Structure formats: structure tokens, C-alpha cells
Amino acid sequence: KKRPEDFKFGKILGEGSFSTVVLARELATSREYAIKILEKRHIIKENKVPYVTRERDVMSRLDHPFFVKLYFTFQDDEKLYFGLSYAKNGELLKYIRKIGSFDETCTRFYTAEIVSALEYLHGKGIIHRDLKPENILLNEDMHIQITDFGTAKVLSFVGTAQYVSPELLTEKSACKSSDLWALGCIIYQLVAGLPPFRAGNEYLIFQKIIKLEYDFPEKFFPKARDLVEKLLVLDATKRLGCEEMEGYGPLKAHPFFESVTWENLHQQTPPKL
Numbered sequence: 451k452k453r454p455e456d457f458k459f460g461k462i463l464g465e466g467s468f469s470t471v472v473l474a475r476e477l478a479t480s481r482e483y484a485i486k487i488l489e490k491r492h493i494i495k496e497n498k499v500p501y502v503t504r505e506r507d508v509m510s511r512l513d514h515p516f517f518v519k520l521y522f523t524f525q526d527d528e529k530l531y532f533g534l535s536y537a538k539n540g541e542l543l544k545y546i547r548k549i550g551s552f553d554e555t556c557t558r559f560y561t562a563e564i565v566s567a568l569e570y571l572h573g574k575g576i577i578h579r580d581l582k583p584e585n586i587l588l589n590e591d592m593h594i595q596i597t598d599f600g601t602a603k604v605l606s607f608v609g610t611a612q613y614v615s616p617e618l619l620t621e622k623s624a625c626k627s628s629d630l631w632a633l634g635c636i637i638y639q640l641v642a643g644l645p646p647f648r649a650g651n652e653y654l655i656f657q658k659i660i661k662l663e664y665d666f667p668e669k670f671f672p673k674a675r676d677l678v679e680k681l682l683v684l685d686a687t688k689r690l691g692c693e694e695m696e697g698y699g700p701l702k703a704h705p706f707f708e709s710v711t712w713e714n715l716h717q718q719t720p721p722k723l
């Protein structure tokens with residue numbers, strides 16, 4: 451079992467309500483991990499014990515390159531430590547903001563791995579419920595690494611405003627289709643630069659979401675547009691990739707992906723941004 455004195459803590463890699471992720475180097479081996487530190491009392495006072503328990507249960511069952519791994523967990527008298535994979539290139543959102551918008555190849559590659567990752571995840575019966583470009587990170591080799599499993603559900607919660615789905619703003623029920631909506635939202639953002647639904651405040655965004663109030667830029671890849679129109683359907687049972695639509699097969703079979711080779715994506719050279 452690992453201890454805090456076994457590490458050299460560095461910069462903070464992201465904060466949160468109940469957590470802070472710190473860059474930590476392991477002394478004996480010199481490997482760098484991103485440690486999520488959570489204070490036991492703030493968790494108890496705020497009834498988050500089922501949310502932390504779940505995260506650890508969820509992460510301990512992922513074994514795929516497109517997800518961040520949990521290497522160890524240890525604790526002291528006041529804090530919990532979940533040692534996680536360190537993704538050197540950080541959030542995908544940054545690369546979008548720095549290049550403005552991805553070319554068709556870059557959108558095809560990254561959309562494919564995101565699409566590939568959700569097929570493994572949903573294949574296991576786990577739902578992210580908070581998928582966004584701030585959770586999709588990039589490793590040394592520039593492959594995606596999906597994190598933030600605190601709000602994950604194994605088949606009560608509502609994620610980040612801009613990537614929420616109509617069903618959540620109505621029924622109060624998230625299914626795999628909630629992830630496929632976020633996916634639809636993230637595609638738009640890769641081609642266009644900005645999320646599809648944008649407004650002055652959360653209420654105006656929610657009202658713009660439920661009315662499907664969004665319009666594609668005049669220079670949007672047509673195949674990518676048609677795919678976005680297919681994921682961004684108000685009716686959750688009519689969403690490409692969902693089980694009522696016969697799953698990932700047809701999503702994976704969509705024209706936008708004609709040249710993609712799904713089998714060894716993690717072994718492929720990512721394109722230059």
C-alpha cells in the first residue's frame with residue numbers, strides 16, 4: 451500500500467467542489483501520476499459518500515486506453531487519494547480554443563476515438579452523465595483519455611448546462627442517449643469551434659436546448675452536419691448509437707466515418723493539429 455510520503459507533490463491539475471487533482475511524482479519509480487485528493491469531512495457533510503464510492507467502483511472496472519486508469523487509492527486521517535493516469539497534454543477544449551476549429555481529418559480521428567470509448571463504456575453498462583471537452587484529455591501520444599467519473603452511473607444527477615439533454619430537463623432520467631447527446635454537442639464544437647447551444651444564462655440555454663434552438667455555420671462538413679442532426683434529436687429513442695436504433699454498429703457505419711478503421715484506433719498515428 452502507497453503513502454503520501456512516497457510522492458513528491460507538484461502543481462494542481464484541476465480543482466472541484468470536493469476534489470483537487472495534483473501532479474505527483476512517485477519517488478522509488480520516478481513515474482508521474484495525477485492524484486485526486488478528496489477531504490473526508492467535506493464529503494460526509496455534503497453527502498457524497500455514495501458519489502465517491504461509485505467513482506472508485508466505476509474506475510476499477512475500466513480497462514481501455516481511451517479511459518484514465520486508477521492505479522492505487524490510499525488515505526490518511528483526513529484525506530482520500532485516488533492515483534490516476536497523468537494526461538500531459540491536458541483538456542481537449544484547450545486544443546479547440548487554440549486552433550479555433552478542427553479540420554475534417556482531426557474531427558474524424560477524435561470523434562472516432564470518443565465514439566469508440568463510449569461503445570466500451572456503454573458496453574459495460576456505465577454512463578458518464580457529464581461528458582464534455584474538459585473531461586476528454588490528451589496523453590503524450592495525443593490519444594484521448596476520458597476522466598471525471600464522480601457523477602458516472604452503473605445501470606438524481608444533471609451535468610454541465612451546455613451539454614445537457616432534453617430528457618434530463620423533463621423526465622429527470624439519463625440513459626446512454628444522454629452521452630450520445632453530449633457526443634452530438636462535442637462534434638459541433640470540434641468543426642464549429644463553439645458549443646451548439648449558447649446563451650446569456652443557464653435558463654436561456656435550457657430553453658434553447660428543449661426547443662432544439664441551434665444553427666450550423668455555413669462552412670460545416672456536410673457529413674459531420676448530417677451526423678450531428680442524427681445525435682441531436684429531441685426524442686431519446688431516435689438517437690444514432692442507442693439500443694432502440696440497434697446500437698453502435700450503424701453509428702460506426704455512418705458516412706462521416708467511411709475511411710475510419712475502428713479495430714486498432716489506439717495503435718494509429720493521430721493527425722497533427
Ligand SMILES: CCc1cc(-c2c[nH]c3ncc(-c4cn[nH]c4)cc23)nc(N)n1
Nearest residue numbers: 463464471484535536537540541597598
Ligand atoms: C476535472 C479535474 C480532473 C482531472 C483529472 C485528471 C486525471 N489525469 C489528468 N491528467 C492531466 C490533467 C490536466 C488538466 N489540465 N492539464 C492537465 C487532468 C487529469 N481527473 C479528474 N478526475 N478530474
